């Protein structure tokens, strides 16, 4: 049978490319689909090195039957409030979240820590030649098998959010869109998000076709 993907390694350190893709799958659901508690995309505030373990039975001076919001974080709320802004979302998960995750030094004692990426820094590519965004790397073969650059996946991620937002709006309020592998927008989203997440951990990027085959599996 298929192997289960623990939320810990998904939200924290994904040493496997497939994990970055699974993370993106949950990201889509937690933004335009079903909102879960454990299958969240935001960094846990109840991290063993941050607050509690958290072992059975809380350890605080408050009502256990009336929790404030230690385990009910909803990224969908923030996304809805920002009107699904590509920049805000990008600078959140790929710039602020991993920055907060870096606080957990106990996670980086052997594995290379993630590097935060800002929307402005990715647009003003300094690592490589900031040439034509249209097409700079000449390749041959399947166009969907051509691994794009960080700029490409960044703008692609932004574009997918646009089409997905209006798609949800077309359905109305209180609607939930299920992720699919045949929808260009949904696929572009998961492909870009995964590539960005893996790029932050210094992991080799993957093509859309390659990810499409494993994202849907």
């Amino acid at each position: 049978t298929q192997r289960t993907f623990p939320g810990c390694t998904i939200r924290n350190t994904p040493s496997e490319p497939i994990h970055c893709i699974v993370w993106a799958k949950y990201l889509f659901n937690q933004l335009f689909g079903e909102e879960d508690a454990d299958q969240e995309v935001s960094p846990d505030r109840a991290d063993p090195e941050a607050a509690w373990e958290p072992t059975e039975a809380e350890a605080r001076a408050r009502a256990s039957n009336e929790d404030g919001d230690i385990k009910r974080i909803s990224t969908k709320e923030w996304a809805k409030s920002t009107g699904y802004d590509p920049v805000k979302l990008f600078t959140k998960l790929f710039k602020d979240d991993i920055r907060y995750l870096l606080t957990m030094d106990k996670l980086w004692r052997k594995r290379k820590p993630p590097v935060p990426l800002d929307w402005a820094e990715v647009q003003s590519q300094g690592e490589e030649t900031n040439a034509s965004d249209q097409q700079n790397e000449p390749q041959l073969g399947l166009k969907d098998q051509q691994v794009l650059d960080v700029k490409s996946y960044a703008r692609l991620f932004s574009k997918s959010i646009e089409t997905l937002r209006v798609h949800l709006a077309e359905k109305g309020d209180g609607a939930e869109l299920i992720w699919d592998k045949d929808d260009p927008s949904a696929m572009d989203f998961v492909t870009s998000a995964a590539n960005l997440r893996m790029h932050i951990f210094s992991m080799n990027m993957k093509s859309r076709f390659d990810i499409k085959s494993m994202a849907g599996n």
Partner: protein
């Protein structure tokens, strides 16, 4: 409160009776006089394929409350098993088994049972419910495997 919980309890049985993972057993207690207690289930979970627990059928008791489904149904193994996330009393520990944690009223019993089977393979190191198992598992994986293997064969349907 009462009534509400029973309405959902009956719903769970209806859903489970229709579709459920192969190998998993779950049914409420048959209260005398041809009645049934929906607040007390006798479920059984088999070892997951690929794990040393494979082959063993572990039975547990699912206790429900009147606050259900707002309150999580505490499950106790009958009898308790050698697992760092299982208290010597039988009380199983899980994030979705606590309301203040990850428990949601919309969680189906199916999700809970599957989660328990998963816990058997991947033990939560954050919850040291069983000191003995926790210590052994942390310093001697080999000795742990032996006890788990014998456990599966011990509770294997014969």
């Amino acid at each position: 409160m009462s009534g509400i919980a029973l309405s959902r309890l009956a719903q769970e049985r209806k859903a489970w009776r229709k579709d459920h993972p192969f190998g998993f057993v779950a049914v409420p207690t048959k209260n005398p006089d041809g009645t049934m207690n929906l607040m007390n289930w006798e479920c059984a979970i088999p070892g997951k394929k690929g794990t040393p627990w494979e082959g063993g059928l572990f039975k547990l008791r699912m206790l429900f409350k009147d606050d259900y489904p707002s309150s999580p149904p505490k499950c106790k193994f009958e009898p308790p098993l050698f697992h760092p996330n299982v208290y010597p009393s039988g009380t199983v520990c899980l994030s979705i088994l606590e309301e203040d944690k990850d428990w949601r009223p919309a969680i189906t019993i199916k999700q809970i049972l599957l989660g328990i089977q998963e816990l058997l393979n991947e033990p939560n190191i954050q919850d040291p419910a069983q000191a003995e198992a926790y210590t052994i598992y942390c310093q001697n994986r080999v000795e742990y495997e032996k006890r788990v293997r014998a456990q599966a064969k011990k509770f294997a349907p014969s």
